[PDB]
């Protein structure tokens with residue numbers, strides 16, 4: 001079980017970006033935080049709650065804290081985890097309405113994004129990566145606004 | 161002369177919009193029933209705000225309140241954008257007041273400047289804001305507010321007197 005104390009920059013940081021360039025084989029685990037997974041390139045086997053997914057560029061996964069998942073049989077798998085703590089979000093967006101897997105396992109954890117969706121996600125995530133400093137005034141609020149933009153754009157662009 | 165949000169905003173639901181002045185023609189003294197941020201991208205002119213004259217050029221930033229009376233008295237290929245907004249229509253629970261001089265009343269200091277970095281980041285966000293605030297696709301209104309919030313925080317971060 002991965003702990004937010006080990007993955008977030010402080011107790012008040014609500015969102016962070018964990019780059020996996022590449023994602024190597026990773027053991028079955030749960031979390032005490034949630035995460036969005038976006039696959040940028042390569043492929044691999046994502047096993048989510050005992051269900052195997054052959055994942056590839058354009059795949060989007062919504063993961064809840066209590067989901068157990070792993071990565072195996074990877075091939076230059078390039079992804080990003082956008083990790084977040086629901087209880088730390090302050091903005092009044094309807095997070096639960098826009099994020100499958102916000103309060104429990106997603107009904108549908110797996111989605112896809114087209115070129116436009118990936119372009120917008122790339123742009124927002126790049127800015128979000130830059131807002132990680134816990135010393136720059138209100139960087140955490142700026143990061144939450146960008147996470148909000150990412151969440152809306154994913155809802156706008158995603159498909160089954 | 162008083163400019164009305166009914167004329168400058170697309171709908172009653174729009175909280176923020178972007179009005180391009182490429183360039184800004186001479187414009188008579190006026191008030192509004194909405195607020196605006198003014199960012200100057202290039203050229204130069206004269207901006208008279210509550211009867212105080214400002215020679216303006218690239219890098220100038222003004223926080224304008226609805227009740228402010230202002231004009232552009234002279235202009236020389238003056239290129240700017242107005243980010244117009246209605247405080248009463250903003251739905252996001254941001255501390256808008258803390259980041260925007262001129263939010264509830266005329267600003268104590270309406271005039272700031274931005275350097276190269278701030279201008280580049282402001283231009284990127286405004287370009288996105290212009291798109292979102294002018295379309296009717298899913299979550300456009302939400303995106304416009306989120307982008308306006310990002311802009312306002314970036315300005316707060318980079319502006320100086």
Ligand SMILES: C[C@@H]1O[C@H](O)[C@H](O)[C@H](O)[C@H]1O
Pocket residue numbers: 002007018020023026031035081083
């Ligand atoms: C944050 C953590 O990072 C790991 O490398 C792996 O990708 C996990 O799925 C994720 O929960």
Ligand SMILES: C[C@@H]1O[C@H](O)[C@H](O)[C@H](O)[C@H]1O
Pocket residue numbers: 163168179181184187192196242244
């Ligand atoms: C919205 C309006 O647009 C005008 O061209 C002028 O720039 C005014 O200052 C502004 O209030």
Ligand code: NI
Pocket residue numbers: 029031035063069
């Ligand atoms: Ni995980």
Ligand code: NI
Pocket residue numbers: 190192196224230
């Ligand atoms: Ni005006």
